[PDB]
Amino acid sequence: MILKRAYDVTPQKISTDKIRGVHKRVLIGLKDAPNFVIRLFTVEPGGLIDRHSHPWEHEFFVLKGKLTVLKEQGEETVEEGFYIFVEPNEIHGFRNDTDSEVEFLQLIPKE
Template sequence: MYLSNIKEAQSIVLNGPGILNARKQSLVGPEQGWDGWVMRQFTLGKDGQTPKHSHPWPHINYIISGKGTLFLDGKEQSVESGSVAYIPGGEEHQFRNVGDEEFAFICIVPEEGDK
């Protein structure tokens, strides 16, 4: 069993090509007993974004707060608090914050996707 609070999770500022104003917190994974999977929270500040990218593993997303866009299937689609998305492996995708407040989402990936 594992119980914690997001306030206790280390927040890592992400840097790299195409990344703007983004942080990641690893919440539950193999270290907490969930073998093979990892649940993370990404937070994008004002004008923040992830890079347009693809990878072989799928992931599941749940938007916690804010307003943003998800680039998927070659087009940008609006997402907001309560939106959910499944992104198959190999699909190019990108999240962007289009609001004035932080845009935060949960991202669940196989363990290989969090290396």
């Protein structure tokens, strides 16, 4: 087996036209042996992953804080301990409406 500390993985700060205030850690990447992509996202206060979609299904698990989830036709705020399933091509995004860092896992089954 492999056993590693998620927070030791190098964080990639992302700042683009549709993502701000976000760091990404690739725990299990596209090119690794396991059949699951696993990323840990840290969202700064006011950070935003704008609405978008991908033809693959995503799962998410909220590790710390309150995470606002953007949807095609609205939004909903959840907190640590929630899990989220996003179907293929389904619009989704994220926002941190709090004064604290919010953390969540992104899980992608490899096809």
